[PDB]
Design a protein around this nucleic acid. Structure first.
Lengths: 97, 180, 47, 43
DNA sequence: CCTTTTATAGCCCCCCC
DNA sequence: GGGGGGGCTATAAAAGG
């Protein structure tokens, strides 16, 4: 899943790659190959490494489901993790199966 | 009765008159679901009037959930306007209410077994299967679900009058089986 | 500052009337500018 | 426990693309520039 | 059949409190 | 373990592969 590319981790990577592409230090193909490696690596690290639970509540503003991918947008949300509160006015959630 | 059946659900259909690219609609419209492998139509919802539409690639659409004829037509007009704004030349042909559901309370218990025994040609009642007695009225052609609690559901109507008429017909029959 | 986003995978998404319940997993969140992660996330929202 | 995962992933990715860079004829210095650009952007 | 909606209501099983 | 939450049962009607 090329799911985790638009994350802090994934975007910093792409930006770094584009530069190297811009200054012609690497080809786009090589950059693509690196991103592919990233997908496998982030996916693997998430399932095997992290292991905590989170909870959230809010009002659903919109939802969409196409290509088996859910995209939500919640308003006035409250993300709950044992050590308490994280409040946000708006949050977008993209979820693959 | 000072008892008036309240409309609870209306299903209508309308023809937008042009083929629709459902993938486009599902990707660009808000509050839409599209899973062709399971259901061939896009399922879209709006909050006012609070209803759910089923939009087919043929251009025909089904509108559900509204509680009044006007809400049903308005809702369908909105769905059609959404599709219209995404770039399709939608029309609004042959809008038509297909089914209406009403409900009410006679405010007293009912002897169901008694009612089904004396109205064997219009009803059926199997408590183990479904706790409600099903009464198939001939005029108007309406199906009622009658519960011992006294709550009543009426469905199958094409127009509001059939709902009111069917309940006026059933009320005296039900009084005849009130629970002492 | 931040576009609060959650990128994850779903186990089960459920709805009754206008009540939605989300059963999510393996997610990377960026809320208020900070970065978070979860193996499982359970949420509730009214539409 | 998050900076840790990121280091972990950056390390794994960098290690796993080294051969690809080499097979492409890209100097290993470029690889290190990638890691540096990447790690600093995180900060 | 797929699916949606809505009033009504008894019984079933199962999840994680 | 249990309760409550979900699902089943029943009703009408439309859409079209």
């Amino acid at each position: 899943y090329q799911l985790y590319r638009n994350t802090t981790l994934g975007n910093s990577l792409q930006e770094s790659l584009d530069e190297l592409i811009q200054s012609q230090q690497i080809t786009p193909q090589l950059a693509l190959q690196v991103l592919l490696q990233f997908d496998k690596a982030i996916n693997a690290a998430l399932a095997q490494r992290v292991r905590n639970r989170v909870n959230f509540r809010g009002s659903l503003n919109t939802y969409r489901f196409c290509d088996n991918v859910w995209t939500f947008v919640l308003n006035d949300v409250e993300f709950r993790e044992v050590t308490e509160l994280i409040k946000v006015d708006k949050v977008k959630i993209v979820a693959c199966d | 009765s000072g008892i008036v059946p309240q409309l609870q659900n209306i299903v209508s259909t309308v023809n937008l008159g042009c083929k629709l690219d459902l993938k486009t609609i599902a990707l660009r419209a808000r509050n839409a679901e599209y899973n062709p492998k399971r259901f061939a139509a896009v399922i879209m919802r709006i909050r006012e009037p609070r209803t759910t539409a089923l939009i087919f690639s043929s251009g025909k659409m089904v509108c559900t959930g509204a509680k009044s004829e006007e809400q049903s037509r308005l809702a369908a007009r909105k769905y059609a306007r959404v599709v219209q704004k995404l770039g399709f030349p939608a029309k609004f042909l042959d809008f038509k209410i297909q089914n209406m559901v009403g409900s009410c309370d006679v405010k007293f218990p009912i002897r169901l077994e008694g009612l089904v025994l004396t109205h064997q040609q219009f009803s059926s009642y199997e408590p183990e299967l479904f706790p409600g007695l099903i009464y198939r009225m001939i005029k108007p052609r309406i199906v009622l679900l009658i519960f011992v609690s006294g709550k009543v559901v009426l469905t199958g109507a094409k127009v509001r009058a059939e709902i009111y008429e069917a309940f006026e017909n059933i009320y005296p029959i039900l009084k005849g089986f009130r629970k002492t | 500052d931040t576009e609060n986003v959650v990128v994850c995978q779903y186990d089960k998404i459920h709805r009754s009337k206008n009540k939605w319940k989300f059963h999510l997993k393996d997610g990377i969140m960026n809320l208020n500018g900070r970065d978070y992660i979860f193996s499982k996330a359970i949420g509730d929202a009214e539409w | 426990t998050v900076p840790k995962l990121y280091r972990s992933v950056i390390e794994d990715v960098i290690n796993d693309v080294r051969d690809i860079f080499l097979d492409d004829g890209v100097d290993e210095q470029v690889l290190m520039e990638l890691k540096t650009l990447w790690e600093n952007k995180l900060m």
